[PDB]
Design a protein around this ligand. Sequence first.
Ligand SMILES: *C(=O)CCCCCCCCCCCCC
Lengths: 41, 1284
Amino acid sequence: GNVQTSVNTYNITGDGNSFTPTSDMTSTAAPAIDLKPGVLN
Amino acid sequence: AAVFGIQLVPKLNTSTTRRTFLPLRFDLLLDRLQSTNLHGVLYRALDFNPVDRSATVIQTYPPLNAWSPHHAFIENPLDYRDWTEFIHDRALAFVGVLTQRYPLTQNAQRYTNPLVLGAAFGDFLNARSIDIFLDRLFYDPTQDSPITAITKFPYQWTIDSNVTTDSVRTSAGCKYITLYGYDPSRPSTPATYGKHRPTYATVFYYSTLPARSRLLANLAAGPTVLEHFDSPTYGPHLLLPQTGDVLGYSSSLISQAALLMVESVMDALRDNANASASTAVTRLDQSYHPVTSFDPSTFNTLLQRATNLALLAVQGVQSESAIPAIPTMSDVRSFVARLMAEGDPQQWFPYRVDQILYWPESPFVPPIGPFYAPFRPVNFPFTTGSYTVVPDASRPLRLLPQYRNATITVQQADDAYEDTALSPLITTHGFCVTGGVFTSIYDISGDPTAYPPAQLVDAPNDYFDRERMARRDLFRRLRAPRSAIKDRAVFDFLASLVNPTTANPVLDTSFSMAYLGASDEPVILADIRSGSIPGLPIPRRIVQFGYDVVHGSLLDLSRAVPTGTFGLVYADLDQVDMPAANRAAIAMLGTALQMTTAGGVSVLKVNFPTRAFWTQVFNLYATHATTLHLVKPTIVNSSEVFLVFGGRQSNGALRSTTALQRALLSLYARNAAIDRAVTHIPFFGVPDDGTSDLGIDAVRLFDPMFSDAVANLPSNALASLVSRVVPSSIMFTRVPSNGPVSTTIYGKRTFLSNRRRARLRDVPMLITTTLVHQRRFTTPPTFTLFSSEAVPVTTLVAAGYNSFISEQTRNPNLAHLLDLGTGPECRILSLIPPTLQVTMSDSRPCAELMASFDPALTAYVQGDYSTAAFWNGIRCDSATAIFTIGAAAAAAGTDLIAFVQQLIPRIVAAGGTRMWLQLNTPLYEVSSLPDLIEIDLRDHVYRFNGGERVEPYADPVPLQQAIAALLPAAALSWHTLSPTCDWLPYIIGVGSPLNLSDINTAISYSRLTPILHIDTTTPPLRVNPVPTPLNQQCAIRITSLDPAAVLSVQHNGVEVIGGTPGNVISVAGAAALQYILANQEFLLQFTPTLPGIFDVFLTTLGQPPVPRGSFTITPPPTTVALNMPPPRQLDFTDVGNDARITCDPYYQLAVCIFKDGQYVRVNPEKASVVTNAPNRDLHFVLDLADNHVLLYLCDVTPSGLGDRIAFPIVDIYRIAFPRNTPVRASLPYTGGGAHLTSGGNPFMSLTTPPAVLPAGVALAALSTSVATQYPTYTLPAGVYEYVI
Ligand SMILES: *C(=O)CCCCCCCCCCCCC
């Protein structure tokens, strides 16, 4: 968790972060991308 | 990143504290001024010339830098002589004026006022009344330094110091004054920045901020107004550059306004460069800042571009290119040039007129006031840290290439290269060959087999041709310079045909010598008369001839000669257009074999030993001489061979033997190899194109911004280039032009890269970090086809397999191949047809991004093959364990035989038809190389470079049967670096020098580590003798179903036995081949006369020749027994006793002593190997020196003599000298002195000839001394004691 600084807009050990799931936003990316012949074209 | 033409290194670094402004006390100011030497204390010559007290420019400090000269001082400037004098005077005389108004003793503890003190001193020099300034020459630190100037008095009249209520308008100082003899012309003079002028600026000092608005507002018409936001010097000033522009820094006159920016920006950069945490600087930055009449939007004017770069230079950014401590015009201009170069005006920090936005996350800590806003860009790429300066590389530094992830597409990664590559690149050749000769003796009178002189290998067609000759010539010059070698080479051999005895002398001491051909006199002549060449006695007189002798008459060996005979008639004339050329040679030899004394030694030199001349020679002079040997000393690629005739006796019988056929055949077999090799090289003086195979292709970039994760051209060209020259070198340089900084990146593009690059499907990127790190100037590029030194004997061998594996893998049916232990970076990818599917493997990770290669064609497996696990799921029809198999046995700390005992069976299971393993077994001899490989016998192991690496080995026989027991049906065969040096297009082909003398070493290093080539796909051979002895008929049987095949066994890269059963031409000995129907195998009744490794080839009428195994006739039992004569019947008289030496006729023995690291042939009169057809004998003459210095019978080969058998005669070494007989006291050697002492009394001295010899002592009839160039006194009878 050693401080980084700019590589990415957020530090992990950064000030006031917060793990907190909300039944509202089910985390996630994009797995079901459609590529099948007819559907991709 | 990069701002315009300037490149900025990632790390940000600035001083972290500011020293509180300290005002000079009145006393210190008094001492500074009244010091012995003002130079350094007050002013300082920027570039003071040692020779003469002369200084072009002088940068000045405080109480002086303020001063601005009046016109009379500018016009007619003074020399550094009267300048030191002028100041050393005025500085003192000024202290007077000022001190008499303020007696130091009472008021020294009062701080002088920086400002007034300046104007008060500058005005004193210009000789202006200084009354007014004194009134307030001091001020209490509490009241501002610039305020006391106002509070004390608002005097708006004194020119150069107008004090108003809020501002003090004074003419800027002159941080640089130029003494007569200064010119901005020279690039060397220190960058003055126009300050050598009097009025280039106008420093406006202000009291308060509102006082400043009123100022800017009022001087808003002026070109521009620079102002120091970071802790101004004496209080906030407001520099206003005059309108004029300086000449020198840019072709385009740079405005004085913009120049001041560069000069400062070039500080904040150079200062950031070395500012450290521990140090406290005055200002956290030295960069100026435009406050008026400045265009904020565009980026044209040098000023705008500079300004734009200073808003960045306040963050701690440092220039990759080291900015000199004392900027010089050449340098300033090279920066003002880099600034002008089209680029992208940094955009992270927008510009303001009253505020410098500084990154919060940056080293720079804002002063105080309202000038620094902590603005934070959305994404600044720089992080902090510094860089320790590294000195300029004395030579172009090579850069190993390590790859990145992203890869460019061949199409794009091509033009990228072709948009910045140095195409028609001029390149030097240097010298590809620097070594000695690769001599090769051949006994024609030796071989007992008759060989029809009509059917020899006649001169190959191509030989005489525009293309071939062009190369034969090119190669010639590519050899760093030749007779000194050749001539000496022939004599190294001629020294072996010397018979000292009376029975039949040959080159007997003081023999006369004829010599034809000289340029002054041949350099070898000096040596023959010196007896320098060991083994050969000093000839009585040498008679020169030829076309340019310069010391003898000029003869034309074609026709008749009017001179007498000579023991040795060394002929070296040239023949050069082929038939009359043959006549020329046949004629020359005819008269040279005429000038020789009856029983002499003629040494002609044929240029084209055609089977057209070989009939005429063996016909005309079929009698003339007794022996005959071809001595081809290959210095360069030519076919001129030397022939020596034995005893010039009328009734000889020099019949053409099979030896000749072999000798002659080996010669040509090599010119095809040496020619084919040289084809890869460009013709001298031709601009480098893409055509030349060995062409050196580079890529010169200008201030290239090699960036990671971006396909920007500079970093895109880097790809191609390295891809176009992988196995090579890749040397990168950085020369600093007074403009930008070019960085060529050449490399020797060979055919070994074309093979590799072809297999590449994409051109991978290179971690540009190493390149981005450099930041130091190296020497300019060179572009030279060859490096300067001859490659290590080890490489001559390695590049001997890269040609072998290349030719093996080139085979179609091979299909899928794997490499057990390829290098960390697959070095085998170059030696394989771009179509074959190979899978290199190694414990370490692969160096090349395996992704760029098509997966189907190239596979890579990690982990060792020594471990059973690795072999799960790896099936290849052919494996190659070259360069690894030896290290695995050592790594796994196991026995060599036992190791391959588990590997071979794995390759069988892996589904392998073929195998090639660079095993290290002494198949030729258990003899080792002194510096290359030591063969520890207590434990089967090697020592490549004795220690550097130790790897166990096996024996030819045990390992042979162990592998035959593993794969019973598989046919084995040993391929080894063949003397034809056909592998050459891998040493001369990649651009590496070598020694024609080392080829011998490597062909001996290759023998220590052969490449056991197995082939499960065919039946193995059957040799009836097994450890086959030389000169014994052996039974070999190739089991081929079809009788209609052609047997062609070839040894050394030259075929020796070829022909269907009926007729078989054999140059290796009597070979009777006959296909037996019953077994269906051609039973070859063969008896060899030459030991070696014969690769049997059975080729069918249709289709390529197919190898069917390889048997090896081993050299005869090397040993030496001597019929040493009894004490009595053996004398110390002149007639030397001779003990018949028992040794295989195969080895030629020669007496010598072991001096230093090599063996030096003893003189023939002292000892020698007189040989009668019935037996070879050791003739020797006893000398008192024999007890101290011992002799050795040594194996005489083209190589350094005495390596195979160097046994020391310890008998002739102990023969005790009696009291009743004369004894010969000689000298030990060419560099040793001695003295005799009979009965413990200094009897005489050999080293120094006694002015008068002792009773009964005289010089001997002969010169038995081992050195041959020393007398050999014979003493009476006594108890002499030789003491060397
Ligand atoms: C420093 O690296 C200490 C370890 C703290 C984080 C390591 C990884 C575990 C937490 C994951 C954060 C990112 C998404 C899980």
